Amino acid sequence: PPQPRKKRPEDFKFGKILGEGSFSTVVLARELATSREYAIKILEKRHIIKENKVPYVTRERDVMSRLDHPFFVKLYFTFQDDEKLYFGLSYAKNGELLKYIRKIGSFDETCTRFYTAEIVSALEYLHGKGIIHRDLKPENILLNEDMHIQITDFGTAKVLSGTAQYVSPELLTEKSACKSSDLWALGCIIYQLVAGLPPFRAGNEYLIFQKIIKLEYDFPEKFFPKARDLVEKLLVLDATKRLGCEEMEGYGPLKAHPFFESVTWENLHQQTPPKL
Ligand SMILES: C[C@@H]1C[C@@H](NC(=O)OC(C)(C)C)CN(c2cc(-c3ccc4c(N)[nH]nc4c3)nc(N)n2)C1
Helix, strand or coil: CCCCCCCCHHHEEEEEEEEECCCCEEEEEEECCCCCEEEEEEEEHHHHHHCCCHHHHHHHHHHHHHCCCCCECCEEEEEECCCEEEEEECCCCCCEHHHHHHHHCCCCHHHHHHHHHHHHHHHHHHHHCCEECCCCCCCCEEECCCCCEEECCCCCCEECCCCHHHCCHHHCCCCCCCHHHHHHHHHHHHHHHHHCCCCCCCCCHHHHHHHHHHCCCCCCCCCCHHHHHHHHHHCCCCHHHCCCCHHHCCHHHHHCCHHHCCCCCCCHHHCCCCCC
16 A cells, blocks of 8 residues: 655645654644644664664664554654664654643642553553563653543563663662553652652662662652552562562552543543643
């Protein structure tokens, strides 16, 4: 089945910068023929070769192409010119989940519940494909125009067959990740929605890591009891004992947790999100 001919830079009107890393930049672009907006990731080939990042770039192109689900940023197309690679990605108009955390301070139980539920539902899909994110965080959990999540940033994903504050203990005591690594990250993110801050904080990276391996953190007095219980079943040193992992029999027990009592799991992206 014939695909549309290769696109090129001149097919777009480029606008503002949407995101920045030291090897790539995401720019908003409007396709002239359609007036559609895309988030185009631009990568300079020479810099990526120089910095030995080719495996990461390929990894992301491969992963983001196979993902077909509303809670994931989609890769629509790729092209390149003499110097640059272009990835046409979903444009998540409302930006980072991190922004909303900073904006409103900390979520109420209704919003925490709904967004956690979406995240859990996205991970179930992802893990179902034998893919592990490895760098899940509020920065790359984006929000669509409709205020549903869209997860992105897959260069560091692992196909089976990170950021200091969200790093799992196994990554510090063995250097080997699994699906439970994502579930640990999830426990950190839930904590952050409720409290307004990540669980493991310190003056520098070394001190942060030191806290992780000791499981040194605690709950504010004001912290939804059932959310606290859930977090405590995710933030567990033993990776095989995190709710949701294969050795704990997967996503059934996770979705059945009392914190999610009122959630309808089947059609989350069709539900109207709670107002922030
Ligand atoms: C830009 C930084 C660094 C980057 N790191 C990288 O490319 O690392 C390599 C090793 C070179 C592969 C990962 N970044 C991203 C960022 C976005 C993104 C950002 C905003 C968006 C919006 N508003 N709509 N859509 C969006 C997609 N999407 C992906 N996929 N990645 C974040």
